[PDB]
Design a protein around this motif. Structure first.
Motif, PDB file in Angstrom:
ATOM      1  N   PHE A   1       3.808  21.838 -24.158  1.00 36.83           N
ATOM      2  CA  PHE A   1       5.090  21.752 -23.518  1.00 36.83           C
ATOM      3  C   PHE A   1       5.913  20.526 -23.600  1.00 36.83           C
ATOM      4  O   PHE A   1       5.603  19.773 -23.359  1.00 36.83           O
ATOM      5  CB  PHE A   1       4.709  22.511 -21.770  1.00 36.83           C
ATOM      6  CG  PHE A   1       4.313  21.232 -21.116  1.00 36.83           C
ATOM      7  CD1 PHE A   1       5.071  20.202 -20.743  1.00 36.83           C
ATOM      8  CD2 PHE A   1       2.880  21.273 -20.616  1.00 36.83           C
ATOM      9  CE1 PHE A   1       4.630  19.130 -19.795  1.00 36.83           C
ATOM     10  CE2 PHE A   1       2.476  20.315 -20.049  1.00 36.83           C
ATOM     11  CZ  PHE A   1       2.987  19.202 -19.566  1.00 36.83           C
TER      12      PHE A   1
ATOM     13  N   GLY B   1       4.036  28.397 -15.161  1.00 36.90           N
ATOM     14  CA  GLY B   1       4.946  28.064 -14.338  1.00 36.90           C
ATOM     15  C   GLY B   1       5.800  26.826 -14.701  1.00 36.90           C
ATOM     16  O   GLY B   1       5.204  25.922 -14.933  1.00 36.90           O
ATOM     17  N   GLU B   2       7.163  27.231 -14.673  1.00 38.37           N
ATOM     18  CA  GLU B   2       7.979  25.733 -15.053  1.00 38.37           C
ATOM     19  C   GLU B   2       8.456  25.043 -14.023  1.00 38.37           C
ATOM     20  O   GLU B   2       8.364  24.103 -14.083  1.00 38.37           O
ATOM     21  CB  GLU B   2       9.200  26.623 -16.033  1.00 38.37           C
ATOM     22  CG  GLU B   2       8.883  27.098 -17.272  1.00 38.37           C
ATOM     23  CD  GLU B   2       8.452  25.599 -18.072  1.00 38.37           C
ATOM     24  OE1 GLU B   2       9.367  25.029 -18.626  1.00 38.37           O
ATOM     25  OE2 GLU B   2       7.345  25.301 -18.447  1.00 38.37           O
ATOM     26  N   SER B   3       9.216  25.835 -12.941  1.00 33.59           N
ATOM     27  CA  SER B   3       9.633  24.976 -11.747  1.00 33.59           C
ATOM     28  C   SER B   3      10.320  26.153 -10.840  1.00 33.59           C
ATOM     29  O   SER B   3      10.881  27.184 -11.146  1.00 33.59           O
ATOM     30  CB  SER B   3      10.745  24.051 -12.138  1.00 33.59           C
ATOM     31  OG  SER B   3      11.322  23.434 -10.899  1.00 33.59           O
TER      32      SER B   3
ATOM     33  N   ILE C   1      -2.094  31.047 -13.371  1.00 35.98           N
ATOM     34  CA  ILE C   1      -0.715  30.310 -13.388  1.00 35.98           C
ATOM     35  C   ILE C   1      -1.021  28.856 -13.912  1.00 35.98           C
ATOM     36  O   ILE C   1      -1.246  28.097 -13.013  1.00 35.98           O
ATOM     37  CB  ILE C   1       0.110  30.588 -12.145  1.00 35.98           C
ATOM     38  CG1 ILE C   1      -0.008  32.018 -11.699  1.00 35.98           C
ATOM     39  CG2 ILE C   1       1.339  29.998 -12.105  1.00 35.98           C
ATOM     40  CD1 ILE C   1       0.554  32.417 -10.287  1.00 35.98           C
TER      41      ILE C   1
ATOM     42  N   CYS D   1       0.401  25.163 -14.349  1.00 36.27           N
ATOM     43  CA  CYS D   1       0.996  24.325 -13.363  1.00 36.27           C
ATOM     44  C   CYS D   1       1.377  23.050 -14.251  1.00 36.27           C
ATOM     45  O   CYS D   1       2.130  22.077 -13.732  1.00 36.27           O
ATOM     46  CB  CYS D   1       0.679  24.021 -11.907  1.00 36.27           C
ATOM     47  SG  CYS D   1       0.591  25.589 -10.918  1.00 36.27           S
ATOM     48  N   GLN D   2       0.871  22.991 -15.458  1.00 34.68           N
ATOM     49  CA  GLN D   2       0.878  21.519 -16.244  1.00 34.68           C
ATOM     50  C   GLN D   2       0.155  20.566 -15.472  1.00 34.68           C
ATOM     51  O   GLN D   2      -0.853  20.102 -16.100  1.00 34.68           O
ATOM     52  CB  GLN D   2       2.139  21.386 -16.695  1.00 34.68           C
ATOM     53  CG  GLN D   2       2.873  22.375 -17.524  1.00 34.68           C
ATOM     54  CD  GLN D   2       3.851  23.375 -16.661  1.00 34.68           C
ATOM     55  OE1 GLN D   2       4.664  22.904 -15.802  1.00 34.68           O
ATOM     56  NE2 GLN D   2       3.350  24.780 -16.328  1.00 34.68           N
ATOM     57  N   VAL D   3       1.093  20.000 -14.725  1.00 35.44           N
ATOM     58  CA  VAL D   3       0.664  18.785 -13.882  1.00 35.44           C
ATOM     59  C   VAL D   3       0.592  18.973 -12.659  1.00 35.44           C
ATOM     60  O   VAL D   3       1.350  19.663 -11.857  1.00 35.44           O
ATOM     61  CB  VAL D   3       1.377  17.657 -14.198  1.00 35.44           C
ATOM     62  CG1 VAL D   3       0.952  16.353 -13.481  1.00 35.44           C
ATOM     63  CG2 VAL D   3       1.578  17.341 -15.901  1.00 35.44           C
TER      64      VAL D   3
ATOM     65  N   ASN E   1       0.923  17.952  -8.625  1.00 35.57           N
ATOM     66  CA  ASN E   1       1.744  17.052  -7.690  1.00 35.57           C
ATOM     67  C   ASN E   1       1.949  17.517  -6.184  1.00 35.57           C
ATOM     68  O   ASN E   1       1.164  18.368  -6.039  1.00 35.57           O
ATOM     69  CB  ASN E   1       3.327  17.283  -8.384  1.00 35.57           C
ATOM     70  CG  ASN E   1       3.908  18.512  -8.046  1.00 35.57           C
ATOM     71  OD1 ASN E   1       4.180  19.073  -7.166  1.00 35.57           O
ATOM     72  ND2 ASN E   1       4.363  19.186  -9.141  1.00 35.57           N
TER      73      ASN E   1
ATOM     74  N   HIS F   1       4.113  19.179  -3.895  1.00 31.19           N
ATOM     75  CA  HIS F   1       4.364  20.583  -3.365  1.00 31.19           C
ATOM     76  C   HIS F   1       3.117  21.545  -4.194  1.00 31.19           C
ATOM     77  O   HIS F   1       2.509  22.403  -3.679  1.00 31.19           O
ATOM     78  CB  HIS F   1       5.845  20.950  -3.992  1.00 31.19           C
ATOM     79  CG  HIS F   1       6.079  22.149  -3.360  1.00 31.19           C
ATOM     80  ND1 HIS F   1       7.213  22.653  -3.329  1.00 31.19           N
ATOM     81  CD2 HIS F   1       5.467  23.011  -2.428  1.00 31.19           C
ATOM     82  CE1 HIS F   1       7.398  23.810  -2.801  1.00 31.19           C
ATOM     83  NE2 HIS F   1       6.249  24.092  -2.141  1.00 31.19           N
TER      84      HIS F   1
END
Lengths: 229, 5, 229, 5
Positions: free
Chosen positions: A46, A151-153, A181, A183-185, A187, A189
Protein backbone atom coordinates in the motif's frame (compact mmCIF):
# COMPACT_ATOMS: atom_id res chain seq x y z
CA UNK A 1 17.41 -3.69 -1.67
CA UNK A 2 14.34 -1.38 -1.58
CA UNK A 3 13.33 -1.31 -5.25
CA UNK A 4 12.59 1.71 -7.44
CA UNK A 5 9.37 0.96 -9.35
CA UNK A 6 9.24 1.44 -13.12
CA UNK A 7 6.31 3.12 -14.85
CA UNK A 8 6.58 0.38 -17.50
CA UNK A 9 5.33 -2.58 -15.47
CA UNK A 10 2.71 -3.03 -12.74
CA UNK A 11 5.09 -5.42 -11.00
CA UNK A 12 6.07 -5.34 -7.32
CA UNK A 13 8.89 -6.92 -5.21
CA UNK A 14 8.32 -9.60 -2.57
CA UNK A 15 6.76 -8.02 0.56
CA UNK A 16 9.15 -10.17 2.58
CA UNK A 17 12.15 -8.21 1.33
CA UNK A 18 10.79 -5.06 2.93
CA UNK A 19 12.85 -3.05 5.38
CA UNK A 20 12.49 -3.80 9.04
CA UNK A 21 12.79 -0.17 10.11
CA UNK A 22 11.05 1.93 8.82
CA UNK A 23 8.71 -1.01 9.14
CA UNK A 24 7.69 -2.30 5.74
CA UNK A 25 9.41 0.12 3.40
CA UNK A 26 9.33 -1.96 0.21
CA UNK A 27 9.63 0.36 -2.82
CA UNK A 28 9.19 3.80 -4.29
CA UNK A 29 8.00 5.54 -7.43
CA UNK A 30 5.76 4.07 -10.09
CA UNK A 31 2.38 5.78 -9.98
CA UNK A 32 -1.06 5.58 -8.38
CA UNK A 33 -2.85 4.17 -11.43
CA UNK A 34 -5.76 1.71 -10.89
CA UNK A 35 -3.83 -1.25 -12.24
CA UNK A 36 -0.79 -0.67 -10.09
CA UNK A 37 -2.72 0.46 -7.02
CA UNK A 38 -4.99 -2.52 -7.41
CA UNK A 39 -2.01 -4.78 -8.04
CA UNK A 40 -0.44 -3.53 -4.80
CA UNK A 41 -3.46 -4.38 -2.64
CA UNK A 42 -3.51 -7.92 -4.09
CA UNK A 43 0.09 -8.37 -2.95
CA UNK A 44 -0.58 -6.74 0.42
CA UNK A 45 1.35 -3.54 -0.42
CA UNK A 46 0.00 0.00 0.00
CA UNK A 47 1.14 3.60 -0.74
CA UNK A 48 1.84 6.01 2.12
CA UNK A 49 3.96 9.12 1.69
CA UNK A 50 3.90 12.79 2.65
CA UNK A 51 3.45 15.83 0.36
CA UNK A 52 6.72 16.39 -1.46
CA UNK A 53 8.16 12.89 -1.26
CA UNK A 54 7.96 10.29 -4.05
CA UNK A 55 5.42 7.43 -3.84
CA UNK A 56 6.41 5.21 -0.91
CA UNK A 57 5.07 1.65 -0.95
CA UNK A 58 4.74 -0.38 2.24
CA UNK A 59 3.97 -3.81 3.58
CA UNK A 60 4.67 -3.80 7.34
CA UNK A 61 5.31 -6.72 9.68
CA UNK A 62 3.49 -7.17 11.97
CA UNK A 63 0.31 -5.98 10.26
CA UNK A 64 -2.51 -4.20 12.06
CA UNK A 65 -5.84 -5.89 11.54
CA UNK A 66 -9.40 -5.82 12.87
CA UNK A 67 -11.70 -8.81 13.21
CA UNK A 68 -15.24 -7.56 12.52
CA UNK A 69 -16.74 -9.49 15.47
CA UNK A 70 -14.00 -8.33 17.86
CA UNK A 71 -14.94 -4.70 17.34
CA UNK A 72 -14.95 -3.48 20.90
CA UNK A 73 -17.94 -1.30 21.72
CA UNK A 74 -18.19 0.34 25.17
CA UNK A 75 -21.44 0.28 27.16
CA UNK A 76 -22.14 3.98 26.57
CA UNK A 77 -21.62 3.64 22.80
CA UNK A 78 -24.36 0.99 22.77
CA UNK A 79 -26.59 3.33 24.77
CA UNK A 80 -25.77 6.12 22.35
CA UNK A 81 -26.45 3.93 19.32
CA UNK A 82 -29.71 2.53 20.65
CA UNK A 83 -31.00 6.09 20.26
CA UNK A 84 -28.56 7.17 17.56
CA UNK A 85 -29.03 10.65 16.02
CA UNK A 86 -27.11 9.49 12.95
CA UNK A 87 -28.07 7.93 9.65
CA UNK A 88 -25.57 5.63 7.86
CA UNK A 89 -25.29 5.11 4.10
CA UNK A 90 -23.00 3.23 1.76
CA UNK A 91 -21.37 4.82 -1.27
CA UNK A 92 -23.60 7.91 -1.18
CA UNK A 93 -20.73 10.39 -1.18
CA UNK A 94 -17.30 8.78 -1.56
CA UNK A 95 -15.83 12.10 -2.62
CA UNK A 96 -17.00 13.96 0.47
CA UNK A 97 -15.78 11.20 2.76
CA UNK A 98 -12.26 11.09 1.37
CA UNK A 99 -12.07 14.89 1.28
CA UNK A 100 -13.19 14.92 4.90
CA UNK A 101 -10.48 12.44 5.84
CA UNK A 102 -8.09 14.57 3.81
CA UNK A 103 -8.79 17.59 6.02
CA UNK A 104 -7.95 16.56 9.58
CA UNK A 105 -4.42 16.77 11.07
CA UNK A 106 -2.46 15.78 5.16
CA UNK A 107 -0.90 12.70 3.62
CA UNK A 108 -3.97 12.46 1.41
CA UNK A 109 -2.65 14.64 -1.38
CA UNK A 110 -4.71 15.97 -4.28
CA UNK A 111 -3.13 13.10 -6.16
CA UNK A 112 -3.98 10.37 -3.64
CA UNK A 113 -7.55 11.63 -3.55
CA UNK A 114 -7.69 11.48 -7.35
CA UNK A 115 -6.25 7.97 -7.33
CA UNK A 116 -8.67 6.45 -4.82
CA UNK A 117 -11.49 8.30 -6.50
CA UNK A 118 -10.76 6.28 -9.67
CA UNK A 119 -10.89 2.97 -7.79
CA UNK A 120 -14.26 4.15 -6.56
CA UNK A 121 -15.47 4.92 -10.08
CA UNK A 122 -14.23 1.46 -11.09
CA UNK A 123 -15.92 -0.15 -8.09
CA UNK A 124 -13.02 -1.14 -5.82
CA UNK A 125 -13.00 1.62 -3.25
CA UNK A 126 -16.12 2.17 -1.21
CA UNK A 127 -17.32 4.52 1.48
CA UNK A 128 -19.64 4.47 4.50
CA UNK A 129 -21.20 7.85 5.31
CA UNK A 130 -22.49 9.04 8.68
CA UNK A 131 -25.16 11.75 8.47
CA UNK A 132 -26.56 13.96 11.20
CA UNK A 133 -29.74 15.20 9.52
CA UNK A 134 -28.62 16.80 6.21
CA UNK A 135 -24.95 17.17 7.26
CA UNK A 136 -22.15 14.69 6.60
CA UNK A 137 -20.52 14.43 10.03
CA UNK A 138 -18.32 11.38 9.59
CA UNK A 139 -17.52 8.31 7.53
CA UNK A 140 -14.72 6.14 6.19
CA UNK A 141 -13.51 4.51 3.00
CA UNK A 142 -11.40 1.61 1.84
CA UNK A 143 -10.60 -0.86 -0.89
CA UNK A 144 -12.67 -4.03 -0.94
CA UNK A 145 -10.57 -7.13 -1.48
CA UNK A 146 -13.06 -9.99 -1.58
CA UNK A 147 -14.13 -10.84 1.96
CA UNK A 148 -11.33 -8.62 3.24
CA UNK A 149 -11.71 -4.88 3.60
CA UNK A 150 -8.64 -2.67 3.51
CA UNK A 151 -9.40 0.29 5.72
CA UNK A 152 -7.89 3.50 4.46
CA UNK A 153 -9.08 6.20 6.85
CA UNK A 154 -12.03 7.72 8.69
CA UNK A 155 -12.97 11.18 9.88
CA UNK A 156 -15.36 12.62 12.45
CA UNK A 157 -17.02 15.98 12.94
CA UNK A 158 -19.50 14.90 15.64
CA UNK A 159 -19.14 12.77 18.79
CA UNK A 160 -19.17 9.04 18.06
CA UNK A 161 -19.67 9.74 14.35
CA UNK A 162 -16.83 7.60 13.07
CA UNK A 163 -17.56 4.89 15.65
CA UNK A 164 -21.14 4.44 14.39
CA UNK A 165 -19.73 4.31 10.86
CA UNK A 166 -17.50 1.38 11.76
CA UNK A 167 -19.96 -0.28 14.12
CA UNK A 168 -22.67 -0.30 11.46
CA UNK A 169 -20.24 -1.39 8.75
CA UNK A 170 -19.08 -4.38 10.77
CA UNK A 171 -22.66 -5.55 11.18
CA UNK A 172 -23.43 -5.25 7.50
CA UNK A 173 -20.03 -6.73 6.66
CA UNK A 174 -20.24 -9.75 8.94
CA UNK A 175 -23.88 -10.34 8.05
CA UNK A 176 -22.92 -11.08 4.45
CA UNK A 177 -19.64 -12.97 4.69
CA UNK A 178 -17.30 -10.16 5.65
CA UNK A 179 -14.16 -11.69 7.12
CA UNK A 180 -11.46 -9.18 8.08
CA UNK A 181 -10.56 -5.52 8.01
CA UNK A 182 -6.98 -4.53 7.19
CA UNK A 183 -5.71 -1.55 9.22
CA UNK A 184 -2.12 -1.64 7.87
CA UNK A 185 -0.52 -0.13 10.95
CA UNK A 186 -1.71 0.05 14.54
CA UNK A 187 -2.23 3.46 16.14
CA UNK A 188 -4.05 5.08 19.06
CA UNK A 189 -7.57 5.39 17.61
CA UNK A 190 -7.46 2.14 15.66
CA UNK A 191 -6.13 0.30 18.75
CA UNK A 192 -8.93 1.42 21.05
CA UNK A 193 -11.37 -0.25 18.64
CA UNK A 194 -10.04 -3.77 18.95
CA UNK A 195 -7.48 -3.74 16.18
CA UNK A 196 -4.55 -6.09 16.77
CA UNK A 197 -1.30 -7.27 15.23
CA UNK A 198 -0.47 -10.46 13.37
CA UNK A 199 2.60 -11.54 11.32
CA UNK A 200 2.91 -10.22 7.77
CA UNK A 201 2.88 -13.81 6.49
CA UNK A 202 -0.28 -14.46 8.55
CA UNK A 203 -2.02 -11.42 7.03
CA UNK A 204 -0.72 -12.27 3.57
CA UNK A 205 -2.26 -15.75 3.77
CA UNK A 206 -5.68 -14.34 4.70
CA UNK A 207 -5.30 -11.98 1.76
CA UNK A 208 -4.87 -14.83 -0.71
CA UNK A 209 -7.79 -16.73 0.81
CA UNK A 210 -10.20 -13.85 1.29
CA UNK A 211 -9.35 -12.01 -1.96
CA UNK A 212 -10.91 -14.98 -3.79
CA UNK A 213 -13.93 -14.97 -1.48
CA UNK A 214 -17.07 -13.17 -2.60
CA UNK A 215 -19.79 -11.13 -0.92
CA UNK A 216 -23.37 -10.75 -2.19
CA UNK A 217 -23.14 -9.49 -5.75
CA UNK A 218 -25.00 -6.30 -4.80
CA UNK A 219 -23.37 -5.83 -1.38
CA UNK A 220 -21.72 -2.54 -2.45
CA UNK A 221 -24.57 -0.83 -4.31
CA UNK A 222 -25.28 2.54 -2.75
CA UNK A 223 -27.98 2.41 -0.07
CA UNK A 224 -28.93 3.27 3.48
CA UNK A 225 -27.53 0.97 6.17
CA UNK A 226 -29.07 2.49 9.28
CA UNK A 227 -31.81 5.05 9.91
CA UNK A 228 -32.15 7.06 13.17
CA UNK A 229 -35.20 7.60 15.38
CA UNK B 1 -6.61 2.86 8.70
CA UNK B 2 -3.04 4.18 8.41
CA UNK B 3 -4.14 7.77 7.76
CA UNK B 4 -5.05 8.05 11.44
CA UNK B 5 -1.43 8.18 12.65
CA UNK C 1 -51.14 16.06 4.49
CA UNK C 2 -48.79 18.37 2.61
CA UNK C 3 -45.68 18.12 4.82
CA UNK C 4 -43.37 21.11 5.36
CA UNK C 5 -39.65 20.29 5.34
CA UNK C 6 -36.71 21.57 7.42
CA UNK C 7 -32.96 20.99 7.71
CA UNK C 8 -33.65 18.97 10.86
CA UNK C 9 -34.69 15.96 8.84
CA UNK C 10 -33.70 14.57 5.47
CA UNK C 11 -36.77 12.38 5.84
CA UNK C 12 -39.85 12.54 3.64
CA UNK C 13 -43.49 11.67 4.40
CA UNK C 14 -44.92 8.57 2.66
CA UNK C 15 -45.66 8.96 -1.10
CA UNK C 16 -49.15 7.58 -0.45
CA UNK C 17 -50.04 10.80 1.38
CA UNK C 18 -49.44 12.96 -1.69
CA UNK C 19 -52.30 15.13 -2.96
CA UNK C 20 -54.46 13.92 -5.81
CA UNK C 21 -54.47 17.39 -7.42
CA UNK C 22 -52.06 18.89 -8.25
CA UNK C 23 -51.05 15.31 -8.93
CA UNK C 24 -48.55 14.02 -6.39
CA UNK C 25 -47.65 17.22 -4.57
CA UNK C 26 -46.04 15.83 -1.42
CA UNK C 27 -44.07 18.49 0.47
CA UNK C 28 -42.19 21.77 0.24
CA UNK C 29 -39.13 23.43 1.73
CA UNK C 30 -35.95 21.57 2.58
CA UNK C 31 -32.93 21.99 0.34
CA UNK C 32 -31.38 20.23 -2.61
CA UNK C 33 -28.48 18.77 -0.63
CA UNK C 34 -27.08 15.41 -1.85
CA UNK C 35 -28.43 13.51 1.16
CA UNK C 36 -31.94 14.86 0.82
CA UNK C 37 -32.01 14.24 -2.93
CA UNK C 38 -30.79 10.65 -2.71
CA UNK C 39 -33.26 10.12 0.08
CA UNK C 40 -36.14 11.39 -2.07
CA UNK C 41 -35.12 9.38 -5.16
CA UNK C 42 -34.96 6.10 -3.26
CA UNK C 43 -38.49 6.78 -1.97
CA UNK C 44 -39.93 7.68 -5.39
CA UNK C 45 -39.96 11.43 -4.73
CA UNK C 46 -38.49 14.30 -6.78
CA UNK C 47 -38.18 18.15 -6.81
CA UNK C 48 -40.09 20.22 -9.36
CA UNK C 49 -40.72 23.92 -8.91
CA UNK C 50 -40.68 27.15 -10.90
CA UNK C 51 -38.08 29.91 -10.37
CA UNK C 52 -39.08 31.92 -7.33
CA UNK C 53 -41.24 29.26 -5.66
CA UNK C 54 -40.10 27.20 -2.69
CA UNK C 55 -38.84 23.67 -3.34
CA UNK C 56 -41.80 21.45 -4.31
CA UNK C 57 -41.63 17.64 -3.99
CA UNK C 58 -43.77 15.17 -5.86
CA UNK C 59 -44.64 11.52 -6.32
CA UNK C 60 -47.50 11.49 -8.87
CA UNK C 61 -49.98 8.67 -9.49
CA UNK C 62 -50.00 7.41 -12.21
CA UNK C 63 -46.25 7.55 -12.81
CA UNK C 64 -44.76 8.18 -16.26
CA UNK C 65 -42.43 5.39 -17.31
CA UNK C 66 -40.51 4.17 -20.32
CA UNK C 67 -39.60 0.55 -20.95
CA UNK C 68 -36.15 0.66 -22.69
CA UNK C 69 -37.01 -2.08 -25.17
CA UNK C 70 -40.41 -0.48 -25.83
CA UNK C 71 -38.61 2.63 -27.04
CA UNK C 72 -40.47 3.68 -30.17
CA UNK C 73 -38.09 4.20 -33.11
CA UNK C 74 -39.62 5.45 -36.37
CA UNK C 75 -38.56 3.94 -39.72
CA UNK C 76 -37.15 7.32 -40.82
CA UNK C 77 -35.06 7.64 -37.63
CA UNK C 78 -33.51 4.22 -37.97
CA UNK C 79 -32.62 5.03 -41.58
CA UNK C 80 -31.11 8.24 -40.17
CA UNK C 81 -29.29 6.47 -37.35
CA UNK C 82 -27.93 3.70 -39.57
CA UNK C 83 -25.91 6.52 -41.07
CA UNK C 84 -25.92 8.75 -37.98
CA UNK C 85 -23.83 11.93 -38.29
CA UNK C 86 -23.50 11.76 -34.50
CA UNK C 87 -21.15 10.24 -31.97
CA UNK C 88 -22.49 9.60 -28.45
CA UNK C 89 -20.59 9.62 -25.14
CA UNK C 90 -21.20 9.01 -21.48
CA UNK C 91 -20.45 11.36 -18.60
CA UNK C 92 -17.94 13.29 -20.72
CA UNK C 93 -19.60 16.65 -20.13
CA UNK C 94 -22.36 16.57 -17.52
CA UNK C 95 -21.97 20.30 -16.92
CA UNK C 96 -22.73 21.15 -20.53
CA UNK C 97 -25.69 18.78 -20.87
CA UNK C 98 -27.54 20.17 -17.87
CA UNK C 99 -26.73 23.71 -19.12
CA UNK C 100 -28.19 22.88 -22.50
CA UNK C 101 -31.34 21.56 -20.81
CA UNK C 102 -31.66 24.50 -18.40
CA UNK C 103 -30.99 27.08 -21.09
CA UNK C 104 -33.22 25.28 -23.58
CA UNK C 105 -35.93 27.58 -22.12
CA UNK C 106 -38.70 24.96 -21.97
CA UNK C 107 -36.54 27.05 -17.63
CA UNK C 108 -37.55 25.34 -14.39
CA UNK C 109 -33.93 24.25 -14.08
CA UNK C 110 -32.65 27.11 -11.94
CA UNK C 111 -28.98 27.48 -11.04
CA UNK C 112 -29.77 25.97 -7.67
CA UNK C 113 -30.97 22.84 -9.44
CA UNK C 114 -27.97 22.76 -11.78
CA UNK C 115 -25.54 23.02 -8.89
CA UNK C 116 -27.34 20.36 -6.88
CA UNK C 117 -27.45 17.86 -9.73
CA UNK C 118 -23.97 18.64 -10.89
CA UNK C 119 -23.04 17.70 -7.32
CA UNK C 120 -24.85 14.39 -7.70
CA UNK C 121 -22.97 13.88 -10.90
CA UNK C 122 -19.73 14.38 -9.01
CA UNK C 123 -20.81 11.89 -6.36
CA UNK C 124 -21.59 9.20 -8.96
CA UNK C 125 -25.39 9.31 -9.22
CA UNK C 126 -26.28 11.83 -11.89
CA UNK C 127 -25.08 10.81 -15.33
CA UNK C 128 -25.29 12.41 -18.76
CA UNK C 129 -25.38 11.25 -22.39
CA UNK C 130 -23.61 13.58 -24.87
CA UNK C 131 -24.45 13.84 -28.58
CA UNK C 132 -21.65 15.20 -30.72
CA UNK C 133 -21.60 16.54 -34.26
CA UNK C 134 -17.95 16.94 -35.12
CA UNK C 135 -16.45 18.64 -32.06
CA UNK C 136 -19.60 20.36 -30.93
CA UNK C 137 -22.15 19.27 -28.35
CA UNK C 138 -25.49 19.29 -30.16
CA UNK C 139 -27.62 17.40 -27.66
CA UNK C 140 -27.90 14.97 -24.78
CA UNK C 141 -29.83 13.85 -21.71
CA UNK C 142 -29.10 13.30 -18.05
CA UNK C 143 -30.69 11.47 -15.14
CA UNK C 144 -30.19 9.90 -11.72
CA UNK C 145 -29.34 6.18 -11.71
CA UNK C 146 -31.14 4.06 -9.13
CA UNK C 147 -29.56 0.67 -9.72
CA UNK C 148 -31.15 -0.96 -12.78
CA UNK C 149 -33.62 1.95 -12.86
CA UNK C 150 -32.88 5.28 -14.54
CA UNK C 151 -34.77 8.44 -13.54
CA UNK C 152 -34.76 10.81 -16.48
CA UNK C 153 -34.47 14.47 -15.64
CA UNK C 154 -34.47 16.13 -19.02
CA UNK C 155 -32.92 16.14 -22.48
CA UNK C 156 -32.13 18.92 -24.95
CA UNK C 157 -31.59 19.16 -28.69
CA UNK C 158 -29.77 21.83 -30.74
CA UNK C 159 -29.70 19.82 -33.98
CA UNK C 160 -32.38 17.60 -35.51
CA UNK C 161 -32.55 14.14 -33.91
CA UNK C 162 -29.78 14.60 -31.31
CA UNK C 163 -32.13 13.81 -28.41
CA UNK C 164 -33.45 10.60 -29.96
CA UNK C 165 -29.94 9.44 -30.79
CA UNK C 166 -28.87 9.99 -27.20
CA UNK C 167 -31.94 8.17 -25.91
CA UNK C 168 -31.79 5.51 -28.65
CA UNK C 169 -28.15 4.63 -27.93
CA UNK C 170 -28.65 4.85 -24.18
CA UNK C 171 -31.54 2.42 -24.31
CA UNK C 172 -29.45 -0.02 -26.32
CA UNK C 173 -26.44 0.33 -24.02
CA UNK C 174 -28.82 0.26 -21.05
CA UNK C 175 -30.79 -2.94 -21.79
CA UNK C 176 -27.72 -4.76 -23.05
CA UNK C 177 -26.24 -4.62 -19.57
CA UNK C 178 -29.19 -5.20 -17.29
CA UNK C 179 -30.90 -1.82 -17.20
CA UNK C 180 -34.62 -2.47 -16.65
CA UNK C 181 -36.62 0.78 -16.47
CA UNK C 182 -36.70 4.52 -17.18
CA UNK C 183 -38.64 6.89 -14.97
CA UNK C 184 -40.18 9.89 -16.72
CA UNK C 185 -42.15 11.04 -13.66
CA UNK C 186 -44.85 12.77 -15.66
CA UNK C 187 -46.10 11.89 -19.10
CA UNK C 188 -45.94 14.68 -21.66
CA UNK C 189 -46.21 15.09 -25.44
CA UNK C 190 -42.50 14.47 -26.11
CA UNK C 191 -42.05 11.74 -23.51
CA UNK C 192 -45.20 9.91 -24.73
CA UNK C 193 -44.12 10.11 -28.37
CA UNK C 194 -41.22 7.92 -27.32
CA UNK C 195 -43.11 5.08 -25.68
CA UNK C 196 -43.43 6.48 -22.19
CA UNK C 197 -46.54 4.96 -20.61
CA UNK C 198 -48.22 5.45 -17.25
CA UNK C 199 -48.46 2.97 -14.43
CA UNK C 200 -49.89 3.22 -10.89
CA UNK C 201 -47.64 4.77 -8.23
CA UNK C 202 -47.85 1.56 -6.16
CA UNK C 203 -46.23 -0.39 -9.00
CA UNK C 204 -43.62 2.23 -9.72
CA UNK C 205 -42.51 2.10 -6.09
CA UNK C 206 -42.45 -1.72 -6.14
CA UNK C 207 -40.28 -1.52 -9.23
CA UNK C 208 -38.18 1.20 -7.59
CA UNK C 209 -37.14 -0.42 -4.31
CA UNK C 210 -36.66 -3.52 -6.46
CA UNK C 211 -34.27 -2.10 -9.05
CA UNK C 212 -32.39 0.17 -6.65
CA UNK C 213 -30.49 -2.76 -5.14
CA UNK C 214 -29.57 -4.17 -8.55
CA UNK C 215 -26.50 -3.24 -10.57
CA UNK C 216 -24.95 -2.78 -14.01
CA UNK C 217 -21.33 -3.63 -14.91
CA UNK C 218 -18.84 -1.97 -12.52
CA UNK C 219 -17.55 0.17 -15.37
CA UNK C 220 -20.97 0.96 -16.79
CA UNK C 221 -21.01 4.68 -15.84
CA UNK C 222 -17.33 5.29 -16.49
CA UNK C 223 -17.00 8.19 -18.92
CA UNK C 224 -16.73 6.62 -22.38
CA UNK C 225 -17.80 6.55 -26.02
CA UNK C 226 -21.06 4.66 -26.58
CA UNK C 227 -21.49 5.03 -30.33
CA UNK C 228 -19.06 6.17 -33.02
CA UNK C 229 -20.09 6.04 -36.73
CA UNK D 1 -38.16 13.78 -18.15
CA UNK D 2 -40.53 16.15 -16.40
CA UNK D 3 -38.51 19.21 -17.43
CA UNK D 4 -39.96 18.89 -20.93
CA UNK D 5 -43.37 20.24 -19.86
Amino acid sequence: RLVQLSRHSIAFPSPEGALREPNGLLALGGDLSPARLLMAYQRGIFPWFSPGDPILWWSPDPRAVLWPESLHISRSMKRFHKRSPYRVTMNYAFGQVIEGCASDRTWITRGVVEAYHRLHELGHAHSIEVWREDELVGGMYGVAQGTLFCGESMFSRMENASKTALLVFCEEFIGHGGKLIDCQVLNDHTASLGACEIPRRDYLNYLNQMRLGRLPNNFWVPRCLFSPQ
Amino acid sequence: FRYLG
